[PDB]
């Protein structure tokens, strides 16, 4: 029986590979060679945040591009005012080793997570004024790698246990469990339509997940090492992955295969974060070389280099409205670019 | 400037004062990571230090300085992801079962892996070879010989510069020093000198155990300061 199942799985993998190669009529490069070049993008640091004490490990842009949340290993979440640089709220965390943070779309709640395996959603609109732990839900058997809000009551979170789950804030229990990853989940990004979400794990592969149905629709194995970063294309039809291989790859859900691989010989350090711009042409990816790089989604050429940070840039994100870019590094100094 | 903007700047200055106040407490406390396999007696060591939670923060004070010892024992075996964040810490407390020769090879392999880790290439490792009493009893009984597991032990002579404690049988001393030399060689190979291993022998009833961590952390911080001030 086991041998029959193994042979069936091998035949299915071969058939999937053949079907994927058949549709490989042309690469994105050949079609994007006729378009004008993006040129050099000389970005300058407009704001410098000097509040965080420890290594900045996470950040996210809410519905409003003025407020910015960022997490540090010291157990502090500071809602930074990008415009005026002021500090809106300071949230002393019970778990110092926080590795993720997200700003809810409604702008009322903010989540976090880390080695404690407990996701603490802090309400920023409490009638008492002070920040309070709304729901300290738990249940994961591993460190929380990423968390993102879907609505005012639903939040998806990734854990080191190699499985993702959707949590119900009001009920405080898992709404659905997502399994299939062989390695610890590390990255998670939500689609613009909120229908599907993609997540990466220590395994050299990615999977597309559905929020309404507890099952994965597609699986991408076009990677050489652990995929640490991932981000949904603004249109929700494609996504770029980041791995320690120091090479970014653009995957399209409609094509179901790699379109363009952004790689270079002089880039040997791994990748930790990836983000797309409003137009999608500027593919911003953070590298362990103590600086971020901007790649062209179409031409694949390096658009620019952000050498402002002196330490490993671990997190970065672009504003929703597309007005500025935030980059958080282990140097405890968050520099905004525009 | 508007009144609301001025009050926002005032609250920002208040939050900055709070952060600066917390910064002193943060930098004044020494963070320590406790690693070791399930066989290692790290739990016993933690219990002795009385001077699905993925994190177990243990705080103890010795000589008017606070120590923050973190024990990660409620997570998967894979550690190449979360071990990175534990960088920049004072020292890493690694515990190995020196009595169990079978798991000794796995412990050595884990120690080698942790030592050669990229992001931890600048953090020292405090190596506590626990269960020395069990190792001594075993090597005295003669039922289990290290030669069966390590052939080099047969051709290993006790270090001449060694300082055997009073009442130590030659076999016990030789075995413990062989294990210590194996660990020191594993740490030396590929070691750029940026971080040093602090091997120590710990027992089940030894009360003078936290002093070892105190001395190791003080030496590590002194060396880091010397490197910062360009004195070395």
């Amino acid at each position, epitope marked *: 029986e086991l041998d029959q199942l193994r042979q069936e799985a091998e035949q299915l993998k071969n058939q999937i590979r053949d079907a994927r190669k058949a549709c490989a009529d042309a690469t994105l490069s050949q079609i994007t060679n006729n378009i004008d070049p993006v040129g050099r993008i000389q970005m300058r640091t407009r704001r410098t945040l000097r509040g965080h004490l420890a290594k900045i490990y996470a950040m996210h842009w809410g519905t409003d591009s*003025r407020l910015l949340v960022s997490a540090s290993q010291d157990g502090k979440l500071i809602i930074w005012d990008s415009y005026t640089t*002021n500090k809106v709220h300071a949230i002393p965390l019970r778990s110092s080793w926080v590795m993720t943070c997200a700003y809810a779309p409604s702008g009322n709640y903010v989540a976090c997570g880390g080695l404690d395996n407990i996701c603490s959603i802090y309400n920023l609109k409490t*009638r008492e004024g002070n920040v309070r732990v709304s729901r300290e839900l738990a249940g994961h058997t591993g460190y929380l790698s990423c968390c993102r809000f879907l609505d005012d009551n639903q939040i998806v979170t990734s854990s080191g246990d190699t499985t993702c789950a959707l949590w119900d804030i009001e009920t405080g229990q898992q709404t659905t469990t997502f399994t299939g990853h062989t390695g610890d989940v590390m990255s998670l990004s939500l689609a613009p339509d909120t229908r599907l979400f993609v997540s990466g794990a220590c395994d050299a592969s990615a999977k597309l997940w559905d929020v309404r149905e507890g099952m994965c629709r597609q699986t991408f194995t076009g990677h050489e090492s652990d995929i640490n970063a991932i981000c949904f294309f603004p249109n929700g039809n494609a996504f770029a992955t980041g791995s320690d291989d120091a090479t970014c790859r653009l995957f399209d859900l409609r094509a179901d295969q790699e379109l363009m691989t952004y790689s270079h010989d002089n880039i040997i350090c791994g990748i930790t974060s990836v983000s797309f711009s409003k137009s999608g042409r500027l593919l911003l990816a953070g590298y362990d070389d103590f600086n971020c790089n901007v790649w062209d989604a179409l031409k694949a050429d390096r658009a620019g280099v952000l050498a402002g940070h002196d330490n490993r840039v671990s997190c970065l994100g672009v504003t929703d409205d597309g007005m500025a870019v935030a980059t958080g590094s282990w140097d405890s100094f968050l520099k905004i670019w525009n | 400037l508007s009144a609301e903007d001025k009050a926002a700047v005032e*609250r920002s200055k208040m939050i900055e004062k709070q952060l600066q106040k917390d910064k002193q407490v943060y930098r004044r406390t020494l963070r320590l990571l406790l690693l070791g396999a399930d066989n290692s007696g790290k739990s016993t060591i933690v219990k002795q230090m009385r001077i699905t939670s993925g994190i177990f923060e243990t705080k103890f004070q010795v000589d008017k300085v606070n120590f923050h010892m973190f024990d990660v024992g409620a997570q998967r075996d894979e550690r190449r992801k979360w071990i990175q964040c534990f960088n920049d810490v004072t020292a890493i407390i690694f515990v190995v079962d020196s009595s169990d020769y079978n798991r000794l090879q796995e412990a050595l392999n884990d120690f080698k892996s942790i030592w050669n880790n990229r992001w931890l290439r600048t953090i020292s490792v405090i190596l506590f070879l626990n269960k020395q009493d069990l190792l001594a009893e075993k090597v005295l009984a003669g039922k289990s010989k290290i030669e069966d597991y390590f052939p080099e032990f047969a051709r290993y002579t006790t270090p001449e510069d060694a300082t055997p404690e009073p009442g130590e049988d030659p076999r016990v001393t030789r075995a413990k020093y062989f294990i210590r030399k194996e660990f020191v060689d594993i740490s030396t190979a590929s070691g750029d000198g940026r971080h040093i291993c602090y091997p120590h022998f710990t027992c089940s009833v030894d009360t003078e155990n936290a002093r070892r961590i105190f001395n190791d952390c003080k030496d590590i911080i002194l060396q880091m300061n010397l490197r910062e001030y360009n004195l070395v």
Partner: single-chain antibody
Amino acid sequence: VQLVESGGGLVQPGGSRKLSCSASGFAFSSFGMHWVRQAPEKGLEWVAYISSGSGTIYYADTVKGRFTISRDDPKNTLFLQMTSLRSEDTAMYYCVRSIYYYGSSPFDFWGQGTTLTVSADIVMTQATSSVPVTPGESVSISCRSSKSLLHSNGNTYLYWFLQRPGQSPQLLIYRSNLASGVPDRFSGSGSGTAFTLTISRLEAEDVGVYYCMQHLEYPLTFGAGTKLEL
């Protein structure tokens, strides 16, 4: 959240009295406190202000020097020392909390108030002092300011307050933005100097005195008040 003021009573001219307000149900340390008086059968008027941590303290020209504000965060209490009380100072003082940050709602909670029976600033002028209207009808209130409240940051520092008969003022609009707990029937719009408050469908409990306030400069001036009679 609840603010309870105390210390009111009869005081002769030239005397001294200290009002006290006990804060509870919120982080008093993070909220800046305001003092607003209301003379009998008259509008509102700002008295003094103290910021978080006692860093910034202000007083109105009508009371500067005589009144001194102080707070004790460890006990969550506010104090307003009054000296040389004048016959004109007879009024009911309301303690108000305020927290300043992007998206905040200053002046969101007004205390129960305490009565004291003794013995340039931007001016705000409302369309009318009284407006009789029937229930269910759409009511529109308007006011004008002598200086443009639209600051360079695009924020219109206008506030609207509703003081129902026998109750303390309640915040309705703190900038078009609707305060928490206020029904959607209330809406605010206006230019840099012309402002309008609209009630899409007036309720029986919506009757009362509507007070405006400018916050472009700390010398706060409250409107003359517009009554809505059922």
